[PDB]
Design a binder for these strands. Structure first.
Ligand SMILES: Nc1nc2c(ncn2[C@H]2CC[C@@H](COP(=O)(O)OP(=O)(O)OP(=O)(O)O)O2)c(=O)[nH]1
Length: 549
DNA sequence: CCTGACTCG
DNA sequence: TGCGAGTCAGG
């Protein structure tokens, strides 16, 4: 733990080498419009700390950041790229991202800072971010010499760790996954996050006003039916009303008490009408709390845009997630909630929203590898069965007899015996190897799969059945986004990606480009990979996200 | 902060 | 006793 570096007062030529480890430090978890608090550069010529005020106003440094021929190794280059966009600076030339490298090597390690990645290779000449900045109300940027040393140590670690990580990825056949898929995707997600999605706040606020009135009415109806006021949003208080006051059957308990889950309340409808009202209330209350109030809280007022963060190194299957706000769980399944999407509008006048979704991509992937309310329920049966639902679960979902449920499942595998063999085989392989893989060589380790405990082992077995299929579908749409943006640029279209929702891409564009997108977007998505079955994509466009159906 | 609710693929 | 996610109010 003894490391020389220069705390620089100005940028010099030797800091602008054609290969460097670069650290552009943003301390806040949400990096949109967040302060850059320090910069570090490590290259052949040495180690350097720079003050942001200095470096980011220096024309040669800004030029270097933006020069794609000056290669930078980083950790979480998307965080830096976006933070720099908010500072009006383009970052190009990122050739290695240690966060994504660590994630591919083992998504279970949950690597979220350089220190945690460093530990994978017994590197310890660097501290955890939390140890440096502290947490919660105590979180603060430390004294410059302490900050400077930390950033340098992080850069130095990225510098030394690149080779060992690349070598391990190659040994796993994951080097191309990193360099040709995840890393190019990171720059594309950076663009999407910075672009944001415009919100119609006038419409959203009016929806909220009307929703409050409706909640009040439903609320009073429930109190009338129950014969008492109580907090409906407390499962504990609700349980007392349902199972003690009204004396309804107790169908399920959890560790804290009586279950009031939606599945349970639906099953209680033959006993008391109040349960349907409560389900409605809890639906409405989530709309109001999360998709009206919560969404308005994160709208940037001057532009009316919301800027999500797509976490690229979180899920265990290779999917993305979306936070603050989550734009991947906006309501669509019931018309009442679906109307929320009318509030998501194009960012320019005379533009339109365009949405394209793969149809049953996971089921097509499985076929390749293995060789309205009714239809909504039928989807859960299809995915449920292939992913290992039991007769109990299926019976409970269709409210049918366990005997009947067992016959459906038997008959299902009768129709698709190759799916059956595959699921048996993939489980045995996971037990032998200790991991499963996707089409593009993404990996998930499953060390619980030989467990002597039934529950623990069974969960791992079902991960073996599910992760390769869900993860392959993730691999595919990731490749489609890369291929799609290349085509957009090639044709000089103004259209651009706004969102990915697992098997869906959401774009905005001038109305004039709608005809071209109707051909281009589905073509690119369908051709991202060639399976033994065709990939099918549906697409629609309209004045709001709601109308793009 | 955890649990159980509602939300999506 | 299908799987992958995030946010919220209540306690
Ligand atoms: N993608 C996916 N969806 C699941 C899973 N489990 C339940 N579902 C539900 C929620 C979303 C829905 C998926 O829709 P699909 O793409 O399979 O079918 P679709 O015919 O294309 O949908 P649509 O009615 O819009 O045309 O099924 C799962 O493991 N993966």
């Amino acid at each position: 733990a003894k490391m020389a570096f220069t705390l620089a007062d100005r940028v010099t030529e030797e800091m602008l080498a054609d290969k460097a480890a670069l650290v552009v430090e943003v301390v806040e978890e949400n990096y949109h419009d967040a302060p850059i608090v320090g910069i570090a550069v490590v290259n052949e010529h040495g180690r350097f700390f720079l003050r942001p005020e200095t470096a980011l106003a220096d024309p040669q440094f800004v030029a270097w950041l933006g020069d794609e021929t000056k290669k930078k190794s980083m950790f979480d280059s998307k965080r830096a790229a976006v933070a720099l966009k908010w500072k009006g600076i383009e970052l190009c030339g990122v050739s290695f991202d240690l966060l994504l490298a660590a994630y591919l090597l083992d998504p279970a390690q949950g690597v979220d800072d350089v220190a945690a990645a460093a530990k994978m290779k017994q590197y310890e000449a660097v501290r955890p971010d939390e140890a440096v900045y502290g947490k919660g109300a105590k979180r603060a940027v430390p004294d410059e010499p302490v900050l400077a040393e930390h950033l340098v140590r992080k850069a130095a670690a990225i510098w030394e760790l690149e080779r060992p990580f690349l070598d391990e990825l190659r040994r796993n056949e994951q080097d191309r996954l990193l360099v040709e898929l995840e890393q190019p995707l990171s720059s594309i997600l950076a663009e999407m996050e910075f672009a944001g999605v415009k919100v119609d706040t006038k419409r959203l606020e009016q929806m909220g006003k009307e929703l409050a009135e409706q909640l009040g009415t439903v609320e009073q109806r429930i109190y009338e039916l129950a014969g008492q006021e109580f907090n409906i949003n407390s499962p504990k208080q609700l349980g007392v009303i349902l199972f003690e006051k009204l004396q309804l059957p107790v169908l399920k308990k959890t560790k804290t008490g009586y279950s009031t889950s939606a599945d349970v309340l639906e099953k209680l409808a033959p006993y008391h009408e109040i349960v349907e009202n409560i389900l409605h209330y809890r639906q409405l209350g989530k709309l109001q709390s999360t998709y009206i109030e919560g969404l308005l809280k994160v709208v940037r007022p001057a532009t009316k845009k919301v800027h999500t963060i797509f976490n690229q190194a979180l899920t265990q299957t290779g999917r993305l997630s979306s936070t603050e706000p989550n734009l991947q769980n906006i309501p669509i399944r019931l018309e009442e909630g679906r109307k929320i999407r009318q509030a998501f509008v194009p960012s320019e006048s005379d533009w339109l929203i365009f949405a394209a979704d793969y149809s049953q991509i996971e089921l097509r992937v499985l076929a390749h590898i293995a060789e309205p309310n009714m239809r909504r329920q039928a989807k859960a049966v299809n995915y449920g069965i292939v992913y290992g639902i039991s007769d109990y679960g299926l019976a409970q979902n269709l409210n049918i007899s366990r005997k009947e449920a067992a016959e459906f499942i038997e008959r299902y595998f009768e129709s698709f015996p190759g799916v059956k063999r595959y699921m048996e085989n993939i489980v045995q392989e996971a037990k032998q190897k200790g991991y499963v893989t996707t089409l593009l060589h993404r990996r998930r380790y499953l060390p619980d799969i030989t467990s002597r405990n039934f529950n623990v082992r069974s969960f791992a077995e079902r991960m073996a059945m599910n992760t390769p299929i869900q993860g392959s579908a993730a691999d595919i749409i990731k490749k489609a986004m890369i291929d799609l943006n290349a085509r957009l640029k090639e044709e000089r279209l103004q259209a651009h990606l706004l969102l990915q929702v697992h098997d869906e891409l959401i774009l905005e564009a001038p109305k004039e480009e709608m005809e071209r997108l109707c051909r281009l977007v589905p073509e690119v998505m369908e051709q991202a990979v060639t399976l033994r079955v065709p990939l099918k994509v549906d697409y629609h466009y309209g004045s709001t996200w709601y109308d793009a159906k």
